RNA sequence: UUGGCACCUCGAUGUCGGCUCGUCGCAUCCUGGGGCUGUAGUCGGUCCCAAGGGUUGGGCUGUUCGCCCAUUAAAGCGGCACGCGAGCUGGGUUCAGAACGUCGUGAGACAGUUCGGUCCCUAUCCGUCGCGGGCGCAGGAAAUUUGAGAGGAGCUGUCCUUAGUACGAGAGGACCGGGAUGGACACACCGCUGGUGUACCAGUUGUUCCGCCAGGAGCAUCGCUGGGUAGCUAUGUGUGGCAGGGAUAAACGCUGAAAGCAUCUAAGCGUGAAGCCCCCCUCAAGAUGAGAUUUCCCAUUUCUUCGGAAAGUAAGAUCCCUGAAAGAUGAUCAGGUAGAUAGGUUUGGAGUGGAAGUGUAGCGAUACAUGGAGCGGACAAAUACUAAUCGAUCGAGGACUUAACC
């Protein structure tokens, strides 16, 4: 597995941040090395989603950030990233056995030449 | 591996009972000295059990004449005539290395 | 620690024989009709070759 | 003097009839085919060229396909020669099964050692560290490059460099078990290489 | 696995209580000694009114170690502490009794006299 | 070595000992071969041949040296800027402080003592160790290779038996050969035993957060503690040195004249070392002397003064992409839908050790059940779900002479 120029806690923070962003926005632009780590971490969260159990919900809730995605309106209740992972995202991969992400190569970034990719669901 | 499992499967001892670390076992070890073959019992608490398949080993610890002695066997050795589980042990971990660092009265394993 | 002699022009030029860039690995598209890096999305079409994104 | 090519599958252990426990390398040698017999008249020395595991067509080229054709066999991943063998034994296109070896037979395993990459003199040449304390600023360094008088460093002043990935021959490994239906040799002890490594098993020169 | 400056409980009647290993015999640059190997050693603690006196230089056979020994059957034996027995020119003990368990490896290195006196031979 | 001389260096050749790394000589310490012996035997002595390998841990001394303890087959002597400080140390020496003894009226001095006392440098070139790119090698390719030449390896103990024999008055006690088993060193590898294992499992403290409870997360060295997979590893495991052949050294001879004898020598044979050359391991055709075998591609097009040039190609290779058994980077090797190359997924496995939720018992801390449960990086197999799409670039058409045969 990749050390991403970070300590163990920083890296675990970075993978939690990127994972949540990928679940919330369904498409993010990041570096190639970051995108090749995320695909593992996000496809495991989507698997827990599809599981759907309380146990599975609590495994995902131990990793996914507590970000409000949107506020829907029923008395307007906010929807958290974790609810969007079990209510919206996972069930749309119910008959797909793995491979919920795809990395498109975009090109190098002006400031540091970093190879940039779009990583997206489906 | 799968081929190494197929090759070693014949060497696996089916008689081997179900023990966990914490169980008091009595190992009936064959002692091959020249041509004569003698049986020597070794009764102690199973301290650890590691490895997969034909490579599985376990370690029995007894206090013999006031000195701790550990005895590691392969689980499937044919030099173990018989393995008797004397008492099941209520322990909370897989390796009882802590049984090395304290003497009597604080090493008596809880019996179920 | 330090250069004993200045490096000559010829010698400096020989050392730089290898300090150079390689041509980019790129080909023309079908849709765009323009150049692109293989295995990248073509931004002229705004997609991955002919496959729409 | 027999020989065969196989892949190192990995290590394990077996109990001898005696009862002793020995460590073993498992060597899978399916699909050995004699490809070419080299003679003193044609090539200048006696050898038999043996091809090992089958390779998908698209992974071979016409030069390869045209050389195995002569032996009426599919292309092969590895092709090695065996010298010091009886060319009368071995026909072009014949299988070479692991039954050429028995139990108790004594072989020499040749293969390439695992790659360590760029290593220093402590690991590569087993040199001594300098002191770690008492004010030392000399730990994992290679020691004096030599005396002053030559105004140069002698060859074979051992220094850091790429470490493994060398051909190695372990001599006098006992074959422990031969299993034809699985095309497997159990060699006592270990042979050079990573798992999946090509290992060349010939009868021991000694 | 006993080297020069290693201390060992003495497992016999011979006054000596603790020895300090001066030399591992049986080879030029031999660093380490295991069960059944002879060492030269000086007596550092001594029972008052014994056969062997403090600060005396004696030969001892190592009869159990924490490093223990590998049998050819695949089995091992380790002990909780390193003990030796003080012997003569001939492999015969100065003491009359041996205490604690002794390793079978003594029965292979021509130390039958000691195995005879051991209460338990493991 | 102690010296003599003052020839290089005072616009610096900047240091004794130790550490690290060795390499060379042989005037040989051990191991091998031999002659003599005050060689009965054992244990020795001495000289000749012999430099292949080997040749130690401590205490005291700053100490080289030495003395001592304990080993060893042995603990060799020298050289290399008293080898090695742009490699290290900084104890000694060698500075400013201070004190003692001593000398000096004194300032001070002493190569008497004592305590304290800044160790700079990013490697250009050659050199050394690794690793690539280029071209060459009379066509272009893909494999398999010969070995000119080079490197590596090269050590040795004890026990039993022969045999209480040979020898000897006894005391004692073999050669030669046979067997077993070690030490040091080397190579490989992780099945075993252990180590590590910062994206594995569990326990646990404080505090903050997730609205609260329950369950979790952050931070505190990875918070700490107990374990631990893959990998990498030694203290772990396997294996090696060997044997053998050829020619020799010293040496012992045979045959043998010069010199009717004798004579190992002049002609001519033989025996004879750990040494030399093979044997064993590795590199190796840039071996420009560019070698060999097998297989593949073929003799295209255009213009050109013949010379040759240009262009699309063949076999084949690459760019690019997925990677690891490979790796600093290149390289190498596995793959690119003619698909298991990676990820995911499913099923396992190691490892941890009994999840959550619910229920039961208990006043409660907790316990038990559901249930070897739940979790499970890197390991195994299956699976085309995701990404290895698409392209492009490079790459032959084979000179002359002669000879034998076409
Ligand atoms: Mg932290
Ligand atoms: Mg590697
Ligand atoms: Mg050291
Ligand atoms: Mg340091
Ligand atoms: Mg010179
Ligand atoms: Mg003058
Ligand atoms: Mg100058
Ligand atoms: Mg000489
Ligand atoms: Mg000293
Ligand atoms: Mg010097
Ligand atoms: Mg110095
Ligand atoms: Mg200098
Ligand atoms: Mg005065
Ligand atoms: Mg001083
Ligand atoms: Mg340079
Ligand atoms: Mg050369
Ligand atoms: Mg291991
Ligand atoms: Mg907390
Ligand atoms: Mg709470
Ligand atoms: Mg803070
Ligand atoms: Mg004569
Ligand atoms: Mg001869
Ligand atoms: Zn396009």
D168 touches strand F (CB under 7 A): yes
Give yes or no for a contact between D97 and D181, defined as CB atoms under 8 angstroms apart. Answer: no
User: Two tokens at A28?
Assistant: 């993010």
Sign of CA dihedral E77, E81, E82, E86: negative
Q: What is the dihedral of CA C15, C17, C21, C23, to 10 degrees?
A: -170
Q: Which two tokens stand for residue E74?
A: 């695949």
Please answer whether residues B43 and B26 qualify as being in contact, where contact means their C-beta atoms are separated by less than 8 angstroms: yes
- As ranges, strand F nucleotides with an atom below 7 A of a protein CB are 19-23, 54-58, 69-75, 80-81, 83-90, 121-133, 141-147, 151-152, 182-194, 198-199, 210-211, 215-220, 222-223, 226-229, 231-242, 279-283, 291-297, 315-317, 319-323, 325-328, 334-340, 343-346, 349-357, 368, 372, 374-381, 383, 385-392
CB D192 within 8 A of CB D168: yes
> Could E64 and B33 be called an inter-chain contact, meaning their C-beta atoms sit closer than 8 Å?
no
Q: What is the C-alpha to C-alpha distance for residues E69 and A21, in angstroms, rounded to an integer? A: 57
Interval between CA A52 and ligand 19 midpoint (Å) = 24
Interhelix angle A32-51/A54-61, rounded to 10 degrees, is: 160
Chain D residue with minimum CA distance to B6: D182
Sequential DSSP letters for D37-94: EE-TTTTSS-EEEEE-SB--GGGS-HHHHHHHGGGT---BS-EEEEESS-TTS--TT-
**Distance from C-alpha of A48 to C-alpha of A42, rounded to nearest angstrom:** 10
Segment (H or E) for C26: strand C26-28
CA–centroid distance, A66 to ligand 20, in Å, is 21
Residue A14's SS3 state is helix
Distance CA D70 to C1' F179 in A: 54
List of long-range contacts for A81-84, beta carbons under 8 Å, 24+ apart? A81/A20, A81/A23, A81/A24, A82/A57, A84/A23, A84/A24
How many Cα atoms within 13 Å fall on the side-chain side of residue B16?
19
C-alpha–C-alpha distance, residues E37 and A37, integer Å? 55
In this complex, the answer to whether residue A109 has its CB under 7 A from any atom of chain F, a nucleic strand, is no
CA distance E30 to C15: 53
Beta bridge partners of B60: B46, B71
Owning domain of residue A63: 1-122
How was it solved?
cryo-EM
Distance D77 CA to F271 C1' (A): 56
Closest listed residue to residue A80, CA positions, set A67, A92, A90, A71: A67
Q: How many whole angstroms separate alpha carbon D6 and alpha carbon A76?
A: 69
Closest C-alpha to D48, from D63, D60, D61, D33: D33
Tokens for D189, please give them: 């002890």
Residue D119: nearest nucleotide (C-alpha to C1'): F130
- Give dist(CA E45, CA B26) in Å, integer: 38
Alpha helices (H) in chain D, listed in sequence order: 62-68, 121-125
Among the listed residues B3, B10, B11, the one whose alpha carbon sits nearest the alpha carbon of residue D29: B3
User: CA Rg, chain C, in Å?
Assistant: 21
Cα(E40)–Cα(E84) distance, integer angstroms: 11
Q: Provide the number of structural domains found in chain A.
A: 1
Number of folded domains that form chain C: 1
Cβ–Cβ gap B71/E75 under 8 Å = yes
Residue the block writes with tokens 């050995």: D32
Sequence-ordered list of residues with C-beta below 8 angstroms from that of D162, at least 6 positions apart, any chain: D115, D116, D117, D118, D119
Domain of residue C6: give its range: 2-53
Distance C4 CA to ligand 5 centre (A): 19
Domain chopping of chain B, boundaries: 1-112
Euclidean distance between CA atoms D27 and D195, whole angstroms: 10
> How many Cβ atoms are within 10 Å of E34's Cβ, its own excluded?
16
E6's tokens: 């290693």
Distance C6 CA to F6 C1' (A): 38
Which nt sits closest to E5, CA to C1'?
A: F58
8 Å CB contact between B76 and D21: no
Q: Which ligand is nearest to the CA of C50?
A: 23
Closest residue on chain B to E118 (Cα): B65
User: For residues B30 and B34, what is the distance between their CA atoms, to the nearest angstrom?
Assistant: 13
**With an 8 Å Cβ cutoff, is E108 touching chain B?**
no
The number of C-alpha atoms within 13 Å of D75 and in the hemisphere containing its C-beta is: 14
CA of D109 to C1' of F167 (A): 53
Q: In Å, how far is E18's CA from the nearest CA of chain D?
A: 31
The breaks in chain E (C to N more than 2.5 Å) occur after: none
Other C-beta atoms closer than 10 Å to the C-beta of C11 total 11
CA-CA distances (angstroms) from residue E32 to D61, E39, E61, E78? 58, 10, 13, 16
Distance in Å from F321's C1' to A28's CA comes to: 22
Do B11 and D14 form a contact (C-beta atoms < 8 A)? Answer: yes
Q: Are B27 and B80 in contact (CB under 8 A)?
A: yes
Question: Measured CA to C1', what is the nucleotide nearest A66?
Answer: F210
Contact C40 A107 (CB under 8 A): yes
Kindly report each contact of residues D71-79 with a partner whose C-beta sits within 8 Å and lies 24 or more positions away, as own/partner: D71/D33, D71/D34, D71/D35, D71/D36, D73/D33, D73/D35, D75/D51, D76/D31, D76/D33, D76/D35, D76/D51, D76/D52, D77/D52, D77/D53, D78/D5, D78/D51, D78/D52, D78/D53, D78/D198, D79/D35, D79/D49, D79/D50, D79/D51, D79/D52
Distance CA D97, CA D197 (A): 19
Nearest-by-Cβ selection for B77 from E74, E101, E119: E74
Tokens standing for residue A93: 């991969």
- For A91, other C-beta atoms within 10 Å of its C-beta total 12
E72 at B interface, C-beta within 8 A:
no
Which residues neighbour C23 within 8 Å (Cβ) at sequence distance 6 or greater? Answer: none
In whole angstroms, what is the distance from residue C49 CA to residue C36 CA? 8
């Amino acid at each position: 597995y990749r050390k991403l120029g970070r300590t163990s806690s920083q890296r675990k923070a970075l993978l939690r941040d990127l994972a949540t962003d990928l679940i919330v926005f369904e498409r993010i632009e990041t570096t190639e090395a970051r995108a090749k780590e995320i695909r593992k971490v996000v496809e495991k969260l989507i698997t827990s989603g599809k599981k759907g159990d309380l146990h599975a919900r609590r495994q995902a809730a131990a990793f996914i950030r507590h970000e409000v995605v949107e506020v829907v309106q029923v008395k307007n209740r906010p929807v958290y990233a974790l609810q969007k992972l079990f209510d919206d995202v996972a069930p749309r991969y119910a008959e797909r056995q793995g491979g919920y992400t795809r990395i498109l190569k975009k090109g190098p970034r002006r400031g540091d030449g970093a190879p940039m990719v779009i990583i997206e669901l489906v | 591996n799968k081929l190494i499992d197929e090759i070693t499967k014949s060497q696996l001892n089916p008689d081997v009972p179900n023990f966990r670390p914490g169980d008091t076992v009595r190992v009936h070890a064959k002692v091959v000295e020249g041509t004569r073959e003698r049986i020597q019992l070794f009764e102690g608490v199973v301290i650890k059990r590691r490895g997969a398949g034909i490579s599985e080993t376990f370690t029995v610890r007894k206090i013999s004449n006031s000195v701790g002695v550990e005895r590691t066997f392969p689980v499937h050795t044919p030099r173990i005539a018989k393995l008797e589980v004397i008492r099941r042990g209520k322990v909370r971990r897989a390796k009882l290395y802590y049984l090395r660092n304290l003497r009597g009265k604080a090493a008596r394993i809880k019996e179920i | 620690a330090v250069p004993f002699r200045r490096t000559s022009k010829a010698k400096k030029r020989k050392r730089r024989t290898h300090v150079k860039l390689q041509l980019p690995g790129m080909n023309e598209c079908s849709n765009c009709g323009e150049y692109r890096l293989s295995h990248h999305v073509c931004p002229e079409c705004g997609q991955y070759d002919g496959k729409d994104v | 003097t027999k020989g065969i090519l196989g892949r190192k599958v990995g290590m394990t252990q077996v109990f001898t009839e005696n009862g002793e426990l020995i460590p073993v390398t498992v060597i899978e040698a399916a699909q050995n085919v004699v490809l070419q017999k080299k003679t003193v008249e044609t090539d200048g020395y006696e050898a038999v060229q043996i091809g090992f595991e089958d390779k998908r067509a698209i992974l071979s080229n016409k030069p390869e396909q045209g050389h195995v054709a002569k032996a009426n066999t599919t292309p092969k991943r590895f092709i090695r020669e065996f010298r010091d063998v009886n060319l009368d034994e071995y026909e072009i296109g014949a299988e070479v099964k692991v039954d050429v070896f028995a139990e108790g037979d004594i072989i020499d395993a040749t293969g390439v050692s695992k790659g360590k990459g760029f290593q220093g003199v402590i690991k590569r040449h087993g040199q001594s560290r300098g002191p770690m304390a008492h004010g030392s600023r000399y730990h994992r360094r290679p020691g004096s490059m030599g005396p002053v008088a030559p105004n140069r460093v002698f060859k074979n002043k051992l220094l850091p460099g790429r470490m493994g990935g060398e051909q190695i021959t372990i001599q006098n490994l006992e074959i422990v078990k031969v299993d034809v239906e699985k095309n497997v040799l159990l060699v006592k002890g270990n042979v050079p290489g990573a798992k999946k490594a090509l290992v060349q098993i010939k009868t021991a020169t000694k | 696995m006993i080297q020069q400056e290693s201390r060992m409980k003495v497992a016999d009647n011979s006054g000596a209580r603790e020895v300090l290993t001066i030399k591992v015999l049986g080879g030029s640059g031999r660093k380490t000694a295991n069960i059944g190997d002879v060492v030269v050693c000086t007596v550092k603690q001594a029972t008052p009114g014994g056969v062997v006196k403090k600060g005396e230089v004696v030969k001892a056979v190592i009869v159990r170690t924490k490093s223990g020994a590998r049998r050819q059957d695949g089995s091992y034996i380790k002990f909780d502490e390193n003990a030796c027995v003080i012997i003569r020119d001939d492999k015969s003990p100065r003491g009359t009794r041996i205490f604690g368990p002794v390793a079978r490896e003594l029965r292979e290195n021509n130390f039958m006299k000691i195995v005879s006196l051991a209460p338990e031979v493991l």
